[PDB]
Design a binder for this molecule. Structure first.
Ligand SMILES: [Zn+2]
Ligand SMILES: [Zn+2]
Lengths: 361, 361
């Protein structure tokens, strides 16, 4: 079908368009405030569904929605209309009152012409293509912090009610096919978050500093997860990468990749053609060795024993070798090319309280 | 100094010995129930510290502690004595009463001869070298489950009070140097756990099945962490490794390594000498690429744009490249040897709700 998006050059617009063009077969007609009146009528008349995302001469009727509905008046089919209103319609301030006037206008128009309408009262939004140093405080904070530019926070206790652009787009796609999410008898976007400005700033700064301490976001917390992804989007195009700390010597190198306080950490060990590393055991520290290039052996020997157990392994067949506690173990490069072993460990490395003890074989 | 360990062939014994010999300079004399009376006197007389871990002719005094104290009677120096009693001393059952008689005996002996004594009331213990199908229900469960042998659980609600052998050993080492952990005026091992048999069996089964779904233990939960390490110790010496699921084709392969619900997952991508993979973008799925062998490029292009950004990278210099949302990206092998890239992703892969969209460049 034909979908027209008013305010298509906006934050939600660019996102909805990108998704719809890739995820669907529908013909998408974009409408922005620089779309000659000629095509505006064109697209509107062709329309099967209208996603009205656009905004709201010091005198005179300048309502854009009014104009749009006016033109749709000559549309054979009764295309459904989606109206993005605000939770501000409640409050009594110019912005809220304006958005309220828009709903009212649309319901009246609907009762006369019969178009099915989906009116949502969205809260503040956040997500990737929002513009910084404009209206969105989150986009501004992400953009600045990712550039070590200082930010200004008047009150960290200020609460924010939000919806992530991903939900917004998923809900619109659901309305587009007549299955909107209803709650309290009205269409309403799911997963609304209530967060403090302070919590946001902390999270953002943590995201930036996580680059250095190889830290990760708590991914089972929806808001944090969504915030992390949007933060990444405001990254300078020349700052997508960062150098890791390689510990180098004659045997090769050992590099930490990812560290977490609850699921261990993973590092990369590189061993030169003939060296052997290890020959030690642990009380409770334990690992998972995975060689992704080269070939060699991982040897074990229970502390109270003489039998040596060997595990020949290489990058051709990917297999993990657990390192059970209480066994000294070592790993050796048996090939002529560097051996690279990915190592997962159940805890952070601490030279003061190490849990590793030297013991050959 | 000289440390004698009675019951040195026991669970805590083997552990204390292993640690002390590697972590310290002290001379360790092991004493077990097969140590001729000759040396028993020998070691006891030489002793500077006694760690009494040993146990408690249907008629007659058969108390081993009584005998030990008797011999120490002829020890010039007044070596400190550590006595492992049980929280059972409270209860009124043969075992508890016995352990109570031991404390009493030691305090009386101490008041006369002046030896400083450290009396602890330990709960049930668990840890690596405990023997299965004997007294420890945890060791038995680990040993069996790791062998797909069925287990028998009469009541899952049975509560267990435990101490992990690591704590036991750390506390003894602290007493050995006169700085025992005091609580309620008595020496007491830290980190006591209270767990249900059912919680234990669940955890154990989860540990075994985690092998297949590439899952990880919740490492910030002390009991689980300790339990996981002990479970690994009961693994058959021929079952330390497991095969990973390699997705193979012409371009190379993609293998999942580690999966978690809260910190993402990491996989291993292997690319043949000239292929290119990717050419897609995501809404909120994001990654971290790290090439550990070979060389190539990671290309980016914002969806609403034409500029192509390139990141030349290889295994010589280890550097992570974040994949920001909203940019299509692809990675290509520019070398003549296979390229292996470690890939961390913020969420599990789901072909139904994929968050990946094809888009060249
Ligand atoms: Zn190790
Ligand atoms: Zn990707």
């Amino acid at each position: 079908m034909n979908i027209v998006i008013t305010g298509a050059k906006g934050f939600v617009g660019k996102n909805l368009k990108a998704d719809l063009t890739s995820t669907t077969d529908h013909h998408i007609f974009e409408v922005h405030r620089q779309t000659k009146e000629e095509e505006l009528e064109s697209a509107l008349l062709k329309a099967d569904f209208i996603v009205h995302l656009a905004g709201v001469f010091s005198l005179g009727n300048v309502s854009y929605l009014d104009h749009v509905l006016d033109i749709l008046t000559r549309n054979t089919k009764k295309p459904a209309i989606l109206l993005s209103s605000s939770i501000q319609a409640t409050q009594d301030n110019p912005y809220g009152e304006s958005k309220l006037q828009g709903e009212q206008l649309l319901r009246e128009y609907a009762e006369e012409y019969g178009n099915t309408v989906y009116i949502y009262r969205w809260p503040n939004l956040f997500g990737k293509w929002c513009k910084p140093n404009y209206n969105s405080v989150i986009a501004t904070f992400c953009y600045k912090i990712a550039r070590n530019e200082e930010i200004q926070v008047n009150d960290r206790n200020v609460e924010l009610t939000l919806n992530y652009v991903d939900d917004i787009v998923a809900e619109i796609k659901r309305a587009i096919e007549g299955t909107p999410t209803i709650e309290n008898g009205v269409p309403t976007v799911p997963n609304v978050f209530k967060v403090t400005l302070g919590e946001i700033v902390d999270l953002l700064y943590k995201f930036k500093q996580s680059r250095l301490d190889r830290t990760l976001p708590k991914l089972d917390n929806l808001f944090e997860k969504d915030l992390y992804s949007t933060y990444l989007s405001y990254l300078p195009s020349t700052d997508f990468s960062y150098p890791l700390l390689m510990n180098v010597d004659d045997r090769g190198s050992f590099t930490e990749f990812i560290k977490t306080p609850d699921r261990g950490q993973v590092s990369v060990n590189i061993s030169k053609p003939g060296i052997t590393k290890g020959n030690h055991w642990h009380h409770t520290k334990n690992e998972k060795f995975l060689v992704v290039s080269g070939k060699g052996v991982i040897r074990f020997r229970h502390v109270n024993d003489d039998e040596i157990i060997e595990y020949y392994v290489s990058g051709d067949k990917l297999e993990v070798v657990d390192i059970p506690v209480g066994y000294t173990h070592n790993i050796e490069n048996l090939g002529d090319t560097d051996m690279v072993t990915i190592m997962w460990v159940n805890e952070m490395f601490d030279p003061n309280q190490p849990d590793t003890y030297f013991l050959e074989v």
